[PDB]
Amino acid sequence: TALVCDNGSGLVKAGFAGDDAPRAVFPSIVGRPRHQDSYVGDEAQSKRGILTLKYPIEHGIITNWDDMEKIWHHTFYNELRVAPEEHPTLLTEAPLNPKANREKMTQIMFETFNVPAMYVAIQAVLSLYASGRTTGIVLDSGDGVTHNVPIYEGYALPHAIMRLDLAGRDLTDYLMKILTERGYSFVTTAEREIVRDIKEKLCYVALDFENEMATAASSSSLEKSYELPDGQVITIGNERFRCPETLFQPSFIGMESAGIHETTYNSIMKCDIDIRKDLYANNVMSGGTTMYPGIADRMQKEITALAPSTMKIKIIAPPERKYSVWIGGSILASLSTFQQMWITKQEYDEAGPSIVH
Ligand SMILES: Nc1ncnc2c1ncn2[C@@H]1O[C@H](COP(=O)(O)OP(=O)(O)OP(=O)(O)O)[C@@H](O)[C@H]1O
Ligand SMILES: [Ca+2]
């Protein structure tokens, strides 16, 4: 059985190729003693009072390799309960991942974990595959980074990839700030977990932000309430949609960047004029931060406004899209026709880490 590990900024998704969903989903966090050994994931969070917690992946890119090794170790031995030397392992990477980073991942998998075979695929490409397509443009938005990735005949078009370092954690941070200003202090890690929950449960993307603001200003009809751990009930109205509006208006958190509708359109415009029609008709949303109710309808509206008036526009937002990258990997790695595409330990021992390219 092959393994699929999809390492994100916020969450690890791991499991077995052929399965419908990752068996293990846990925070991409490593904790080491504050005062001198390590813990990963939920247990690191539980023992946070005695540990320094770190995220080895920053906006989709591995930046702490020693801690990343702990993530992988924990994934194999504690979460999946397998011996990595017994299983071909498919890993994922961010769009525009540096060549040296892909080489380091490869070296670690073979030399440290002794996997018999491995493969590294681009996250957004796997999401496209999970939707049954080989041509389309993916918007992948997680906890740490958002990318637009146009793909033609199975391959990403790297020149046309767009990146926004604005994603779920920034949205949680903004909601924390908003609620703190209203007099409900959310600052600590325990408090961040509460606000992340409020965000996931109550936030949504307005179809027309101005109209929605007017509605919230003139009626209680958009209000929702939420009981905090201390027993206070907080009610939110316009916070529900102001928070994810930041994706379309990055200026809400002081960023001068284009919003996700603009990055989508700009990405399509970088592509060959002769494939744009196919991209417009095959916009696939991937990742946890695309889960907001209303986001597909809003994107449809915004892309329609930017594109030629005769252009057929379609946004595809699969219900399973928290796990689309992982599912794409599960499909690819279990595919009878992919079995000759693995990099084997033998090939690695002959040629070294650069074989991965
Ligand atoms: N229902 C939801 N509504 C809004 N946000 C959600 C929802 N469910 C999950 N999220 C957010 O999705 C993010 C996690 O998604 P995902 O696993 O795709 O990211 P990742 O792979 O860890 O990060 P990245 O891809 O940025 O490196 C978190 O910010 C989480 O709060
Ligand atoms: Ca991801």
Swiss-Prot record:
How would you describe the post-translational modification of this protein? Answer: MICAL1 and MICAL2 produce the (R)-S-oxide form. The (R)-S-oxide form is reverted by MSRB1 and MSRB2, which promotes actin repolymerization.
Q: What class of enzyme is it?
A: hydrolase
Catalysed reactions listed for this entry? ATP + H2O = ADP + phosphate + H(+)
Domain of life (superkingdom): Eukaryota
Q: Name one GO biological process term.
A: actin filament bundle assembly
According to the UniProt entry, which residues carry Tele-methylhistidine? 59
Enzyme Commission number(s) from the entry: 3.6.4.-
Modification ADP-ribosylarginine, positions:
163
- Where N6-methyllysine occurs, the residues are 70
Return the annotated region ranges for Interaction with alpha-actinin.
96-109, 344-356
* Cellular component terms (Gene Ontology): actin filament; actin filament bundle; cell body; cytoplasm; filamentous actin; filopodium; lamellipodium; skeletal muscle myofibril
Q: Where in the cell is it found?
A: Cytoplasm, Cytoskeleton
Key words of the record:
Acetylation, ADP-ribosylation, ATP-binding, Cytoplasm, Cytoskeleton, Hydrolase, Methylation, Muscle protein, Nucleotide-binding, Oxidation
Q: Which residues carry this modification: N6-malonyllysine?
A: 47
InterPro entries tied to this protein: Actin, Actin/actin-like_CS, Actin_CS, ATPase_NBD
A GO molecular-function annotation? protein domain specific binding
| Residue runs in coiled coils | none
Q: Give the multimer and partner information.
A: Polymerization of globular actin (G-actin) leads to a structural filament (F-actin) in the form of a two-stranded helix. Each actin can bind to 4 others. Interacts with alpha-actinin. Identified in a complex composed of ACTA1, COBL, GSN and TMSB4X. Interacts with TTID. Interacts (via its C-terminus) with USP25.
Record function comment: Actins are highly conserved proteins that are involved in various types of cell motility and are ubiquitously expressed in all eukaryotic cells.
Annotated family:
Belongs to the actin family.
Q: What else is known?
A: In vertebrates 3 main groups of actin isoforms, alpha, beta and gamma have been identified. The alpha actins are found in muscle tissues and are a major constituent of the contractile apparatus. The beta and gamma actins coexist in most cell types as components of the cytoskeleton and as mediators of internal cell motility.
What protein name applies here? Answer: Actin, alpha skeletal muscle
Native source organism of the sequence: Oryctolagus cuniculus
